[PDB]
Design a protein around this ligand. Sequence first.
Ligand SMILES: CCc1cccc(-c2c(F)cccc2[C@](O)(CCCNC(=O)OC)[C@@H]2CCCN(C(=O)CC3CCNCC3)C2)c1
Ligand SMILES: *[C@@H]1O[C@H](CO)[C@@H](O)[C@H](O)[C@H]1NC(C)=O
Length: 334
Amino acid sequence: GNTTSSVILTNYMDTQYYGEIGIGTPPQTFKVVFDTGSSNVWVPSSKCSRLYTACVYHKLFDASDSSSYKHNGTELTLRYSTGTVSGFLSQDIITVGGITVTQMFGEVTEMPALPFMLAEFDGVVGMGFIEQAIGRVTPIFDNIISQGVLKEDVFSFYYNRDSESLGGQIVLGGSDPQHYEGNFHYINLIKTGVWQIQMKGVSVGSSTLLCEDGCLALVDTGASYISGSTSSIEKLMEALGAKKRLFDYVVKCNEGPTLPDISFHLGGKEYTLTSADYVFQESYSSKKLCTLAIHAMDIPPPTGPTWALGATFIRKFYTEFDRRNNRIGFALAR
Ligand SMILES: CCc1cccc(-c2c(F)cccc2[C@](O)(CCCNC(=O)OC)[C@@H]2CCCN(C(=O)CC3CCNCC3)C2)c1
Ligand SMILES: *[C@@H]1O[C@H](CO)[C@@H](O)[C@H](O)[C@H]1NC(C)=O
């Protein structure tokens, strides 16, 4: 063991957190989202048509400019809530800061304009389990464990607020004590295969409203917002007094700071987010509407129904993902 490597992340306005990786010899670089909610790796491809204008506006992998390439070409499709991305598998040598692994990844040749014209990232790196991976394709953190290079079989996340500075920082093989305070509070996974833990309550003010008897909480580094079931979120947004719109929830900007705290009850402690954490205070005007960084999503079986504690949450709490001990550690971020 003994190794620990830390990649550095750009924060596009608290909604996209991406960092650099290389593919090939010589390396071709890609801005990518590291995603505990998924297990596959992909980037856009040469063989993407120019019909897909998402591919025009992103960096493309070219197989023919890597001496380490290893054609497979098996079809791959990846479902996200905003439609799918399709491509073919291939293999090449991938660099993640200081670590280099031979990895099987997807070359996307169908990349929709919704959502990806708004995407500052090119690709995604799945940090979930092979159980979740499409194809039973060995995920990248499995292969990094296989190497016996890491100090401990863990990785961890730091998301900062967008101040205008350090955007964020993933750390493979451990955690950065400079970006959290106190010690970790650890919570064992329900089961292997999903970065998903049991939640024992969701509370507004002192009044514990929902998940009273218990429910699951997926810990999702690829998610921008906290999310819950539609029936959970409507009961939450009713309590907060937020209006719905086509796709998000809003409040009058002047009301934001007076909104109640939201507490999530995890491994015995409560994990509190104040209106400062969960609102986008662009102004404090009565004349404007400010978005809450929370929304509805009914994640299907088997993974859901479940809450997803995305970036809105991780910003406040540094998150270690323990693959050795099949648990998650939380700690007040700084
Ligand atoms: C992770 C790959 C992905 C998949 C689907 C959509 C996007 C996407 C996009 F293409 C353009 C702009 C914005 C987004 C996102 O905001 C995520 C940005 C990255 N993630 C992050 O930086 O998190 C800290 C969505 C918006 C639609 C609603 N979203 C979700 O449902 C989150 C899921 C996305 C896939 N991974 C599991 C959570 C956020 C990205
Ligand atoms: C693609 O990968 C699978 C391994 O599951 C294998 O069956 C197939 O032979 C591979 N094809 C090539 C061209 O490497």
